[PDB]
RNA sequence: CCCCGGCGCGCCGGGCCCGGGUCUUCCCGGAGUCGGGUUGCUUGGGAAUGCAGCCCAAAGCGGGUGGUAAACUCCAUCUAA
RNA sequence: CGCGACCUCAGAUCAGACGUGGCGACCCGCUGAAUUUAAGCAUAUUAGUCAGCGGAGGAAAAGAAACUAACCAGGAUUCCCUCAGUAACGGCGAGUGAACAGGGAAGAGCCCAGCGCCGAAUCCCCGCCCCGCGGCGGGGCGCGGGAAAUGUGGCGUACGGA
């Protein structure tokens, strides 16, 4: 009965999803995360919906 | 020992509380088990509504909650009698019955009678033998469209009567709400004693008279 | 409507008629053993309104229990503790003498199922109770849907778990503000619920 | 046995009135006495527990039903083809037996 | 004595009959049948 | 590819000879139990929450509950053994 | 005196059944401390807990109001959240301490005795015939035996019923 679990406020969790998405559209931050995106045509990378099938 | 300012605390940990600690690590498992039984029950009783029998409208007791209505346990035998539904037949067609409940006022009674008449109007009734319809069974054209209903049957809501703005009359302006409130308390407080004093005076005056 | 008359007659326990019957019957019950198979219900009306039926597989036993309270079975009256627990006399047992009577019938006839019991007599020393038992394997019982319930293994030794009417009266059950001690089904059930620390995952 | 023959005879008759009879049992006799439908009540002298009938002699007297006490619940038992009977009652008789 | 109860409880011995019950239970205690012969 | 189960459809031999409403006339209840005193235990239950022993011991428009003992009086709410 | 009913009570390696012991995490019924805290200690607390005894089941127990309330009323039981460390208890010290309402999980309701009416309309077992037969039952036939009027069965139970 150690307290293994933590409550995080919804507004802060959504805040965290927004910062992650904003930081995912910047080449410097994505490169600084170690991803080899030196030749990806654009950031964010959007592909047609055919790929869903 | 107390140390400077603080709160005085009395934790209830003077028994063998560690012998009776209820953890909740099975909580996700319970949620999946209960969900898996709602689905298996909904499949079993389909196309009957998954929520269950229709429940009546009731007003919550006490002054803290009497402004709210909620689902009751079952329709009263007076409500079912007024709607012309036999009490033993009511359960067979998804109507919940509560023989304990009384009807003190007409409005609540008629509210649940209209509820039962509306529900009876939405009821699609399959014949006992599919190939041999009967008197009250729904037509085949509306049996094809029958689909299981999710959520409580005809959900109960608290609807407020919007009153539009109106010109204030001099009679409402002259009303004294606080003076009226204070005098109403006093009259209720002194009602019994005042009658007792009045009765004695009548006897007190009568004895001199006769 | 004879059972109506007998019931009312057995309410007049201080009348000349009933006093004479109780006194001589108590004398006769006193010359028998503490456990004694009875041939029929001494109180057919009282027995039947407690579930007894006049068919094969229902049996009656008369149990004799000593009257009085419970002495603490400690040597020389020594309890070896604090003064709050020094009592030896004037202590009472948690269950009625009727319940004790049913338990002594149920333990002896381990192959039968105690149903109910009733009062038939008492003197300064003994109370006399007749216990209604059922044989759960007689086909007069197994093939009757209304009595198939008591042939189930969950109903073994009802008298020994406080399930009979006499036994359940000492369990503090009931609805309303007088019986909060047993919300949850029993005193221990209420205690466990009220004494268990719920440590939710997210707290 | 002879109820079977009566039933079979009715079966043949159907393919092609209730006579008077004794009423037995302290519960049946009691209702008849209260209804004044009984003409004569015979009570065994050795019913035990006695409370079964201890009230009947006074009840019959109140309702004006003639009653008698007979030696032997076994003798009343033999009448009704059973081991014992606490009491029996006449409600009707044939005309040749009215006297 | 919890230690003494686990020195002679069910399981510490041979389980001569109980462990065949555990096997029979998994097939509903079927009786009077055999696998279909070759 | 085996086995077990569940759900459906027909035949045979049985059982039931089945309901609703409005009027008319009738009927209706669990006792050494309740309740009371006292003792001991028990409860948050405090002029006594529950349980038990002993004594007393019911009624039938009654009985129980209505968180301060009691009398009178209305009410509400249930229907114990 | 003998015979025969009944009642009460016996003996049978009588025919056919059933109980015992175990396990015991969880469950029900009892019985039941003292370490301990109170900076001492006796009430209190520890605690209706340990130990002790009995009885179960896959769950148990509880459960369809002799309830809650006092509202414009709710409506079996169990569980979760909250009520609430609150009303209350307490050398009113240390400490202890529920309920109702409200939101949810689940949801299901029923049966006797009695009062009555029905020719006991009821039940058990034996023997024979058909069917089934490793859950011993269905139907038919016995002037076969017993139980049961000291009351079995059907209708019916407070929501009223006939
Ligand atoms: Mg310090
Ligand atoms: Mg105790
Ligand atoms: Mg159960
Ligand atoms: Mg009592
Ligand atoms: Mg009752
Ligand atoms: Mg104690
Ligand atoms: Mg205490
Ligand atoms: Mg008061
Ligand atoms: Mg033998
Ligand atoms: Mg100390
Ligand atoms: Mg110290
Ligand atoms: Mg010390
Ligand atoms: Mg102490
Ligand atoms: Mg305690
Ligand atoms: Mg223990
Ligand atoms: Mg044991
Ligand atoms: Mg055992
Ligand atoms: Mg088992
Ligand atoms: Mg109950
Ligand atoms: Mg409930
Ligand atoms: Mg708070
Ligand atoms: Mg305590
Ligand atoms: Mg609540
Ligand atoms: Mg729900
Ligand atoms: Mg009856
Ligand atoms: Mg009721």
Swiss-Prot record, chain C:
The modification Phosphoserine is found at residues 33, 96, 99. There is a cross-link at residue 82 (Glycyl lysine isopeptide (Lys-Gly) (interchain with G-Cter in SUMO2)). The keyword Transferase does not apply. GO terms for cellular component: cytosolic large ribosomal subunit. It is found in: Cytoplasm. GO terms for biological process: cytoplasmic translation. Signal peptide: none annotated. Belongs to the eukaryotic ribosomal protein eL15 family. This is Large ribosomal subunit protein eL15. It comes from Oryctolagus cuniculus.
From Swiss-Prot, chain D:
It is found in: Cytoplasm. It comes from the Eukaryota. Component of the large ribosomal subunit. Interacts with CRY1. Interacts with DICER1, AGO2, TARBP2, MOV10 and EIF6; they form a large RNA-induced silencing complex (RISC). Belongs to the eukaryotic ribosomal protein eL8 family. Component of the large ribosomal subunit. The ribosome is a large ribonucleoprotein complex responsible for the synthesis of proteins in the cell. This is Large ribosomal subunit protein eL8. It comes from Oryctolagus cuniculus (Rabbit). The chain holds residues 161 to 266 of 319 of the full protein.
Swiss-Prot record, chain E:
It is found in: Cytoplasm. This is Large ribosomal subunit protein eL37. Component of the large ribosomal subunit. The ribosome is a large ribonucleoprotein complex responsible for the synthesis of proteins in the cell. Belongs to the eukaryotic ribosomal protein eL37 family. Component of the large ribosomal subunit.
């Amino acid at each position: 009965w150690r307290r293994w679990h933590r409550r995080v406020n919804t507004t802060q969790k959504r805040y965290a999803i927004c910062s992650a998405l904003a930081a995912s559209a910047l080449p410097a931050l994505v490169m600084s995360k170690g991803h080899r995106i030196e030749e990806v045509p654009e950031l964010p990378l959007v592909v047609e919906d055919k790929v869903e099938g | 020992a107390p140390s400077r300012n603080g709160m005085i605390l009395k934790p209830h940990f003077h028994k063998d509380w560690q012998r009776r600690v209820a953890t909740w690590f099975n909580q996700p498992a319970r949620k999946i088990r209960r969900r898996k039984a709602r689905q298996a029950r909904a499949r079993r009783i389909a196309p009957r509504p998954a929520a269950g029998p229709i429940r009546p409208i009731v007003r919550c007791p006490t002054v803290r909650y009497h402004t709210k209505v909620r689902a009751g346990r079952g329709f009263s035998l007076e409500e079912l009698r007024v709607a012309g539904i036999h009490k033993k037949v009511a359960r067979t067609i998804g109507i919940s019955v509560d023989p304990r409940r009384r009807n003190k006022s007409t409005e609540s009674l008629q509210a649940n009678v209209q509820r039962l008449k509306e529900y009876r109007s939405k009821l699609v009734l399959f014949p006992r033998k599919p190939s041999a319809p009967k008197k009250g069974d729904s037509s085949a054209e509306e049996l094809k469209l029958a689909t299981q209903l999710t959520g409580p049957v005809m959900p109960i809501r608290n609807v407020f009567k919007k009153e539009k703005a109106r010109v204030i009359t001099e009679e409402e302006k002259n009303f004294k709400a606080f003076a009226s409130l204070r005098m109403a308390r006093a009259n209720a407080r002194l009602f019994g004693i005042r009658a007792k004093r009045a009765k004695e005076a009548a006897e007190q005056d009568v004895e001199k008279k006769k | 409507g004879a059972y109506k008359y007998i019931q009312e007659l057995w309410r007049k326990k201080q009348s000349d008629v009933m006093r004479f019957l109780l006194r001589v019957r108590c004398w006769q019950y006193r010359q028998l053993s503490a456990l004694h198979r009875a041939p029929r219900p001494t109180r057919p009306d009282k027995a039947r309104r407690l579930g007894y039926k006049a068919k094969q597989g229902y049996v009656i036993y008369r149990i004799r229990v000593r009257r009085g309270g419970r002495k603490r079975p400690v040597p020389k009256g020594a309890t070896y503790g604090k003064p709050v627990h020094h009592g030896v006399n004037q202590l009472k047992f948690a269950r009625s003498l009727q319940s004790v009577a049913e338990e002594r019938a149920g333990r002896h006839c381990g192959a039968l199922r105690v149903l109910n019991s009733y009062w038939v007599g008492e003197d300064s020393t003994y109370k006399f109770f007749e216990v209604i038992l059922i044989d759960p394997f007689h086909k007069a019982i197994r093939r009757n849907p209304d009595t198939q319930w008591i042939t189930k293994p969950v109903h073994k030794h009802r008298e020994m778990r406080g399930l009979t009417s006499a036994g359940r009266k000492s369990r503090g059950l009931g609805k309303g503000h007088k019986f909060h001690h047993t919300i949850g089904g029993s005193r221990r059930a209420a205690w466990r619920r009220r004494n268990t620390l719920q440590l939710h995952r997210y707290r | 046995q002879e109820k079977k023959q009566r039933l079979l005879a009715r079966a043949e008759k159907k393919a092609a009135k209730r006579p008077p009879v004794l009423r037995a049992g302290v519960n049946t006799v009691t209702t008849l006495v209260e209804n004044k439908k009984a003409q004569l009540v015979v009570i065994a002298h050795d019913v035990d527990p006695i409370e079964l009938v201890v009230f009947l002699p006074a009840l019959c007297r109140k309702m004006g039903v003639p009653y008698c006490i007979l030696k032997g619940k076994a003798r009343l038992g033999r009448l009704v083809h059973r081991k014992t009977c606490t009491t029996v009652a006449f409600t009707q008789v044939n005309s040749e037996d009215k006297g | 004595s919890a230690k003494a109860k686990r020195r002679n409880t069910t399981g510490t011995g041979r389980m001569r009959h109980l462990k065949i019950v555990y096997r029979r239970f998994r097939h509903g205690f079927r009786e009077g049948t055999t696998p279909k012969p070759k």
